[PDB]
Design a protein around this ligand. Structure first.
Ligand SMILES: O=C(O)CCC(=O)C(=O)O
Ligand SMILES: [Fe+2]
Length: 272
């Protein structure tokens, strides 16, 4: 039922639970302590504001509203409760206020630290990390940030079932509703105070399917949120470390060699 829990150290991940990283790789997810001094306020503010007009709200948070009017970053899902902002690095440079930019950067830093820690533990040669991940390990992949608002007034599922497409996702949640497919059933992934949820995506699963401990990409969904006042709607925000939009990645062989190449576009294609 319950997830492994770790804290990020300078050297990697210190797991406080017995299953350690081995169990977390099988689970496709684990709990990660929010680092000391990390400020979640910008993300919570964005999730309460991004879908409202700039004129409708206080002046102090004007930079957090009006994302419906930007081009290519706001998405209203027609058959689900979620509406969201999905934005890459250059978009955040142009459209996020500095404190929000800093928090997203800190979350991507954590996600890259997780990626490096798992590559270390699986025995991937240090000199091939950049090649194998298309530079995502060094912060030169596509680094997506998502802010999700679950509109509980919609009589729909919260979020479609899916696997994340990239390597590592660092997710902030405060409410139940997230579920993971284990066996032929959905299992709840509930929030734990003082923790992020971390999950792995399809690119990490593709990279490692031949290793002694393959990384599983978590198949997950969000169940329909029960109706409640909008100011108390379920929200989440997350940073995703993905391969770059073009180029080859490389599957890792049993002896640590970066072996066969895999096309990022054929991968995204066969994904969806
Ligand atoms: O809201 C959640 O708990 C899940 C969010 C998610 O799966 C995503 O944004 O990719
Ligand atoms: Fe997801």
């Amino acid at each position: 039922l319950r997830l492994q829990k770790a804290r990020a150290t300078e050297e990697g991940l210190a797991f406080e639970t017995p299953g350690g990283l081995t169990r977390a790789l099988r689970d496709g997810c684990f709990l990660l302590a929010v680092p000391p001094g990390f400020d979640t306020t910008p993300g919570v503010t964005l999730c309460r504001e991004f879908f409202r007009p700039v004129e409708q709200g206080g002046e102090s948070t004007r930079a957090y509203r009006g994302f419906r009017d930007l081009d290519g970053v706001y998405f209203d899902r027609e058959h689900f409760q979620t509406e969201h902002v999905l934005i890459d690095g250059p978009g955040r440079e142009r459209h996020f206020p500095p404190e929000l930019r800093r928090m997203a950067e800190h979350m991507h830093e954590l996600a890259r630290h997780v990626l490096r820690t798992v590559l270390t533990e699986l025995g991937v040669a240090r000199e091939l990390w950049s090649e194998v991940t298309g530079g995502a390990v060094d912060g030169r992949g596509t680094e997506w940030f998502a802010a999700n608002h679950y509109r509980s007034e919609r009589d729909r599922l919260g979020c479609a079932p899916h696997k994340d497409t990239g390597f590592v996702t660092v997710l902030y949640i405060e409410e139940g509703g997230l579920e993971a497919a284990t066996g032929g059933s959905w299992t709840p992934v509930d929030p734990v105070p003082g923790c992020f949820v971390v999950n792995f995506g399809g690119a990490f699963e593709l990279l490692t399917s031949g290793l002694d401990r393959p990384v599983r990409a978590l198949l997950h969904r969000v169940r329909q949120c029960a109706p409640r006042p909008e100011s108390a709607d379920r929200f989440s925000f997350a940073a995703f470390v993905n391969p770059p939009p073009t180029g080859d990645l490389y599957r890792v062989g049993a002896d640590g060699t970066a072996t066969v190449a895999r096309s990022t576009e054929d991968f995204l294609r066969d994904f969806n």
